[model samples]
Target: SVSKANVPKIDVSPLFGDDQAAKMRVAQQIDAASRDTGFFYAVNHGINVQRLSQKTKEFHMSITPEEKWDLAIRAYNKEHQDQVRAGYYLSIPGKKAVESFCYLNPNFTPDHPRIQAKTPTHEVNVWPDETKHPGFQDFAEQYYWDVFGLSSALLKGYALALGKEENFFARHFKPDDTLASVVLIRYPYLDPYPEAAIKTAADGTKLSFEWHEDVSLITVLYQSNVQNLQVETAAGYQDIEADDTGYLINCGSYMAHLTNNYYKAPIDRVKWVNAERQSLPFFVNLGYDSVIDPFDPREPNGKSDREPLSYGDYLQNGLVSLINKNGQT
Candidate 1:
């Protein structure tokens, strides 16, 4: 029943030019789904489904349960350090931020190591040496390209649906100007819990990551059928469903800003599930140096005079904080 309810059904004609009416229907679905649910399933997305399947299979084969734990610890340890950068998600009670890394900007100012490296707010990605995992690079590169295309197309659709130029945000994105990261995460089988579980913190809320929104423009996630994904909504924490070839497109902080805070970001968590789950989460951000200004047509009101934020700085700092908070060190 959980799987049946959580599976997402998406209509794809709007993305393909089947007709204006069809396109309008898809666009309407996107707008409504994003506005109300802050999430939606992408159907007719042009990704090679077979490629994803193969990649997933290869991913599973490449990392066994033991290997998964080993790599997870290695990743966790790096996350606690200043130089390592990444993103992670968990499907177990204690496993929220474990298997992710960040791709740092090449031009990061080394002089600000304390703030840039130690803080976890910077966007430096902790890359696992390709030599260790020969197939990882190929898979990563391919996945990035596909995700980039998917994000670009969807961004254009979102712009059109919002009555803006398709390329409105394209100019700001360059190879070096942006950071697009894809994380490969796996969840182990869940353990049974007899009582309400909670971890105490300095202030006494659960100790890991506090409730916060993502800093990316959008997050496109491919999730395996798992029972632990929960999202906070008007009703309560609802479990996420995994539909066939279903991928979730959720609004992020960038969308909130673009819509002048009218659009809200979704809050979600991954707790332990009964079965292992794998996900590919893609993040899109602007170049670190781009100045946030009021002159931009899409700039949010009341944001004027606010300091421009750099994707690089945000990612870098966030990674460090996550690592430290997660007890990776």
Candidate 2:
């Protein structure tokens, strides 16, 4: 049994408007939230949640049930088909319920300089054949950029929260950045069964994703109206309720490292029970060649023990580890 607490919702209207003082106030709140929970929901950040939700539903519905099931099952049976670049993934074999796809930004082409500089692991953005999927590709691409714009603004606020100039972190993610990716996840419904039927980790807790931390700078999650997501806070595990009108923002490992651990990356997981759940989480990071260094205007003497590493190297290493763990390689 887990407790419940509302993740603070910060309205960032001032950040985009003319009120500098209000922006700073919001930034302070963001700083506080990040330090405490490493998670918060942002409202008034300028993304059309309703439209995005509808488009998400449309994209999922566009794919027939047969296709969805086939992709999930076949990808597992044909071990060589699970390409991280632009394909389906089942974290656990035979668990068709835990399936997802990674979609790269369509704007970045194969011949683009950013792609040319990276390995095949980072270059491809897979799309369903246009003839069959129709508008799915276009809608996904548009939503990716729309969320990217919102993330760009939020990072500026994060900089201000850290007592640095608003653009301190923003400058690292130019249009040509190669590390951003969107993951579309679907948790299918299960038939009613004994509660004990669910698998449990060694800790005796029922498992879905189990407890884990993200590896990017920050993650923007848009979840369906499901109540299975939870984050580990100082008090213990607490439920993260669904909010379609806002995006849940959480600091990732890289962000925490860059902040000298001032802002921590919280452990979170999903434990679905009966219903279906869908989420689109965008992982935002610096450009491939950009280096991460601590930035704190208030603490001139403060330093991070973390050595600087190019974003590309960090991402590639993480991906390689994930592939190895899943026995994909």
Candidate 3:
């Protein structure tokens, strides 16, 4: 029988405080949770929840099906068929249940070396018709900046968790030139698909969000209350209810690489129900040029000896591993 997943809820407020002992305790809490479930409920990390929800709903609803289709990623699945800049797409191909408008950082400039060289990963963002959806770009940019700070702070917690100074990971980020991507997603109401039937349906269409791990350093999910997330575990696919008041934080492949699998990325998926639901995930990627090398003097879980690689190359390798041309991960 399946049971609910017990993801730890951490009070991260101490991460910003001056209390050394209090901060490390929270860091230890993060350390344990990262090694255990690789997921946690971050309470009090400080972002305007109401604004996130309000703006997400306001932005997604403001556009029509036709307007969204104009920017659908079906035209170009660049950077491994997943990465996109300012476009909408079915989370799973040929499915309407889960859709997303995803884009990378807008801070890159026309004259930036990468852009000037026409780097594929640094492609300019495309957006919905501003005439059709005024303030759309502004909302994306604002929300992106909002969560950007939170993720940066969380990196400190992670750095501390690894028994390093709070700012150990600080050197990897570029404030203006981030690879951070914000995915505005909506799970439209689907016909009832009971949780009892765990396998994919006969028609080869999973209602929404097929099983996948995020391709990120860390992903901060500005989640909604409509329970739809589940994680794989020893027992089975365990249900994980959402906390409207907190951000759902999880480590990803980039983290595993840096720590040599000292911290592993959890494999999880979403299960859309008959009710409408939404999710805002800020995929905080390492800077494009940052090198992902396993930590020195290895931690307990560090069992890798792979050579360090640039984040750009890491992304290309991930693109191929995500699935083959036939769509298999």
Candidate 4:
């Protein structure tokens, strides 16, 4: 029976307060929430909301399905071909070859084979031209920086929750270790199968997306003033009202592992009743090199079954097992 007021509202601004009391209060709230819920909503996260909204509009209008498909095809071929060097490439799921395109971030490692070997899903992002989509870059850059700051603060909270030195997680972050993806995804309200076996209600409502867990750590999701989000809990699937100017933080599998699954990673979905649904979701991941299993000095050295695992090994091996389980390549 948690009251709305009691559900821990973290004022993002206080995280950088000059006053010791304010900073300490922020830290205390963050620590308590992370240990208990493994998730929380943040306000004043320093994101340029204006820029984000503008860019989202541009993306919605700029790329046609056909154009997106063409780009995805080109990106895929470049990734699948060994002749093509890859640090990062982006493509749609089922596209054939076109020439290569990329937006390289400064965080990439040099002279790394994995960098060259990675393909679209594992590679770098391919952004649509801002010329055709004005304010796109501005929005992306602002959103990235803001999310990065939030993620850093959350990591610190996790350290405190785990009874470790405050800088524990921060120490592992390299320039590139904070790699994450920000996606502005939209699902149409119209059901593709109006008369098919899975029909929508006569009221014209449809599901935006099905139940699934994110592969990243913490997902920062902003609803576009829509009431489509729902979460599956012990109480059953219920509506997640999109409070104005609020962002929902759903912990991911990686973070779940990091915390030994202490947090409840709720399965969520979105159903649409209007023309479209939009969400700005930031997926946070540790660098490919950071170790997933950290050394907890407090734990008895030989009493626990927990063993240390490197980030690289966990990702590669984990992906293999994951794909096999899903019957995907």
How many residue-pair clashes does candidate 2 contain?
0
TM-score of 3: 0.85
Backbone clash tally (model 3): 0
Q: Write the per-residue lDDT of candidate 2 for residues 189-217, one digit (tens) a residue.
A: 76643444355655466756666777688
- The number of the candidate with the highest TM-score is 2
Q: What is the lDDT of residue 224 in candidate 4?
A: 70
Q: What TM-score does each of the candidates earn? A: 0.69, 0.87, 0.85, 0.72
User: For candidate 1, lDDT tens digit of each residue in 200-262?
Assistant: 433333322234466577788877665455566766556667653767887777666556554
At residue 12, give the lDDT of candidate 2: 74
Model 4 earns a TM-score of: 0.72
Q: Give the distance in Å from residue 267's predicted Cα in candidate 1 to where it truly belongs.
A: 1.3
- Scored by lDDT, model 1 comes in at 0.56
| Model 4, residue pairs in steric clash | 72-92, 73-95, 73-96, 74-98, 88-124
Off by over 4 Å in 2: 64-82, 90-94, 117-121, 192-198, 295-300, 322-329
Model 2 Cα shift for residue 123 (angstroms): 2.2
Model 3 residue 154 lDDT?
A: 85
